[PDB]
């Protein structure tokens, strides 16, 4: 009855870095970087990383390595009353599996369609393009008027998404069968990557987490060699210290770092719960976080060296080219850039392969975190049939992802992307931090870390765990709850009932912790004071 330790330390390191670096690093980081300063956004980014990001990452890595019980059942040794964090994380994982794998299916569809001598998003001659189409890079003879479109945007919104057949979340109509097949392939790959446990998932990661870096290096070389990349990099790094004063830039930096490291999802607990007890978690936490941050920086460089090239081609400012916010920056913008590259039909393939692989390992990590939590919590029914319950998890994830594959499924992608994993995960991480620091002793936790590694964490880590880190998490959550979003994917301003539905998604994930607190308080006997005292201390079997 021993845990299946990692085959090598490199297995754990590569798994964690593959989890941390995801599709968000590619479109979200450069986007939020230029929107809030450029090189002036790198001062708040690193400050938030040092003060709130690394502490949580390291804390939960050490916690998982010491208690080594996953997410649901690890609270039996920290603070039993907070066992609802595991179920909240399970629900959040359900939503993330609903939308993330659909995005990966879009990437796979692009990769499959990019096996032709002429890429299908180059001209408007196709049968999906409308009368608003005009070549993006053609001469000024064809002006952009006020409502002109580009071949790649129509390829993305009328052929791949078929968003034009749906008129919002009101009629989430039909289902693209091509995207269904693509997501089925994605899910079979996912299942066969993690079905046997960590032994096989640590060896699949060897490629799935290192291949994106090779593709990023080649793409960066190409973008640097492009004419006009200097515009892009200069617009990416040119600091705007005036933008620093507003609290919005710091808010965005803190949120970006927290969601990039991805603590509080129960997956770092699952990963750290496998490597040896005496393994060094401080060093690997530091190196993994540094690698993740540098990867975000280099991915932003890759994106902007091409954004500036495209802006130079049209003789326009780089600001007028990057207004594409989310995945449109990769499926419309970078697709247009690739279509005009000299050796096209090869950069498209590697670009979409990097996208699919760097999403594939974040999916592996999340699903493995959920699986580890459930297996640890219920070893009497599961943990004998490791093959099973991963088939069930993948099947339910696919079923929940079916609504995201409909014709109006990109709207659901964006609704889940903003509300699922919103103030729900942030509150979960805050509750975990308070449960490990305040409720569970901090002197006790540092004693555990000392017994595990060999030295007690320094005063900086202690202060960050106690006050600064939960304070920053609360500052991020308070930011989100004040501003209601104004989602707008493709000329579709979302309705108010959609905002209410998103708030309901947020409530559903977080309506596990309070209900479990109430249930646990009811179950235990004695007066209220002793009822909470008993429910607060670890069981200590």
């Amino acid at each position, epitope marked *: 009855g021993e845990r299946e330790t990692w085959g090598k330390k490199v297995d754990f390191l590569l798994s964690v870095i593959g989890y941390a670096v995801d599709l968000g690093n590619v479109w979200r980081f450069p986007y939020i970087c230029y929107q809030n300063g450029g090189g002036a956004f790198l001062l708040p980014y690193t400050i938030m990383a040092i003060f709130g990001g690394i502490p949580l990452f390291y804390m939960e890595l050490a916690l998982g390595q010491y208690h080594r019980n996953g997410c649901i059942s690890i609270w039996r040794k920290i603070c039993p009353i907070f066992k609802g964090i595991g179920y909240a994380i399970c629900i959040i994982a359900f939503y993330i599996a609903s939308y993330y794998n659909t995005i990966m299916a879009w990437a796979l569809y692009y990769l499959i369609s990019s096996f032709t001598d002429q890429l299908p998003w180059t001209s408007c001659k196709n049968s*999906w393009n409308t009368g608003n189409c005009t070549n993006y890079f053609s001469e000024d003879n064809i002006t952009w008027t006020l409502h002109s479109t580009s071949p790649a945007e129509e390829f993305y919104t009328r052929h791949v998404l078929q968003i034009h057949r749906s008129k919002g979340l009101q009629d989430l109509g039909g289902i693209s069968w091509q995207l269904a097949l693509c997501i089925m392939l994605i899910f079979t790959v996912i299942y066969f990557s993690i079905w046997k446990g960590v032994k096989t998932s640590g060896k699949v990661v060897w490629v799935t987490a290192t291949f994106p870096y090779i593709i990023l290096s080649v793409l960066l070389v190409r973008g640097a060699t492009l004419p006009g990349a200097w515009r892009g990099v200069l617009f990416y790094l040119k600091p705007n210290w005036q933008k620093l004063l507003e609290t919005g830039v710091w808010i965005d930096a803190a949120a970006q770092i927290f969601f990039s490291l991805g603590p509080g999802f129960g997956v770092l607990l699952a990963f750290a719960s496998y490597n040896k007890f005496n393994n060094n978690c401080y060093q690997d936490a530091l190196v993994t976080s540094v690698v993740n941050c540098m990867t975000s920086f280099v991915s932003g460089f890759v994106i902007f060296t091409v954004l500036g090239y495209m802006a130079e081609m049209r003789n326009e400012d780089v600001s007028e080219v990057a207004k594409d916010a989310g995945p449109s920056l990769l499926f419309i913008t970078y697709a247009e850039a690739i279509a005009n590259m000299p050796a096209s039909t090869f950069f498209a393939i590697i670009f979409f392969l990097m996208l699919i692989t760097l999403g594939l390992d974040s999916t592996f990590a999340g699903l493995e975190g959920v699986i580890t939590a459930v297996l640890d919590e219920f070893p009497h029914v599961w943990a004998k049939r490791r093959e099973r319950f991963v088939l069930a998890v993948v099947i339910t994830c696919f079923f929940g992802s079916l609504v995201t594959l409909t014709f109006g499924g990109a709207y659901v992608v964006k609704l889940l992307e903003e509300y699922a994993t919103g103030p729900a995960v942030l509150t979960v991480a805050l509750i975990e931090a308070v449960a490990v620091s305040w409720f569970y002793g901090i002197t006790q936790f540092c004693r555990d870390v000392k017994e595990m590694l060999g030295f007690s964490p320094g005063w900086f880590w202690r202060i960050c765990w106690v006050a600064i880190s939960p304070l920053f998490l609360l500052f991020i959550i308070c930011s989100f709850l004040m501003s209601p979003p104004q989602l707008r994917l493709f000329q579709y301003n979302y309705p108010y009932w959609s905002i209410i539905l998103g708030y309901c998604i947020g409530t559903s994930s977080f309506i596990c912790i309070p209900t479990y607190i109430a249930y646990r308080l009811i179950i235990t006997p004695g007066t209220f004071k002793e009822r909470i005292i008993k429910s607060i201390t670890p069981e200590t079997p």
Partner: antibody, heavy 118, light 110 residues
Framework: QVQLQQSGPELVKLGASVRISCKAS????????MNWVKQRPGKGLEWIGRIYPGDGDTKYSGKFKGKATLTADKSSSTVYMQLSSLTSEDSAVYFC??????????????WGQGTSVT | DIVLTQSPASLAVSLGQRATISCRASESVDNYGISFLNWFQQKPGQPPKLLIY???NQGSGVPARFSGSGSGTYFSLNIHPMEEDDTAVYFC?????????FGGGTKVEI
């Protein structure tokens, strides 16, 4: 206003060739397919081929793959169509039509008056 | 290469009676929600004047009389009560596939 004008009638010699042109105006010709359809006397329409000026892409039916070749000229806004090995079967009226955009069902909105080769 | 067959090759419809012309595509002409099937009308010795596009949308400068319906593989061109000035030949063209093909044609007459 969109109007397509094409050359006048020609003569059909066995084993000869002709050069039927279709000047276009009133729209951005470089973003619409330019179809050709044959009309035998006393018969129905018969699609011949396609051409997309701006890209040069051309499609043909399974009867004119070698008989007819389409060409475009972005300077003069004219689309040509060369016919080779003129038999008495291909003496007909060739119309130069202009397809709509993909969303409009590629409907051939505007037609030329038709060039009769006899 | 989708073969289109127009069942009523001849319409002897009198004034005031609507004329129904059918089309039959071997394969489905629909794609991205747009039935790729236009209807044309050709007077004796005149270029084919477009009538319907997308099998349902009205042409340009065409009377409301001419109405197209149907989706998938079966399409119709239900011409509201006919009159003397529209006794022509109506063709059924599909614009889905590498090679677009016309229909057999359907002459109409009193």
């Amino acid at each position: 206003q969109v109007q397509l004008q094409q050359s006048g009638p020609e003569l059909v010699k066995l084993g000869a060739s002709v050069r039927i042109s279709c000047k276009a105006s009133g729209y951005r010709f470089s973003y619409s397919w330019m179809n050709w359809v044959k009309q035998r006397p006393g018969k129905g329409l018969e699609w011949i081929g396609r051409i997309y000026p701006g890209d040069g892409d051309t499609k043909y039916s399974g009867k004119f793959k070698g008989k007819a070749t389409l060409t475009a000229d972005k300077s003069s806004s004219t689309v040509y169509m060369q016919l080779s090995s003129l038999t008495s079967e291909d003496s007909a009226v060739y119309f130069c039509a202009r397809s709509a955009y993909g969303s409009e069902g590629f409907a051939m909105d505007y037609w030329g008056q038709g060039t009769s080769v006899t | 290469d989708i073969v289109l067959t127009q069942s009523p090759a001849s319409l002897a419809v009198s004034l005031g009676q609507r004329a129904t012309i059918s089309c039959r595509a071997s394969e489905s002409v629909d794609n991205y929600g747009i039935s790729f099937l236009n209807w044309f009308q050709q007077k004796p010795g005149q270029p084919p004047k477009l009538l319907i596009y997308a099998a349902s949308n009205q042409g340009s400068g065409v009377p409301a009389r001419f109405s197209g319906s149907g989706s998938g593989t079966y399409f119709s061109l239900n011409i509201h009560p006919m009159e003397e000035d529209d006794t022509a030949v109506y063709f059924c063209q599909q614009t889905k596939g590498v090679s677009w093909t016309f229909g057999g044609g359907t002459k109409v007459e009193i």
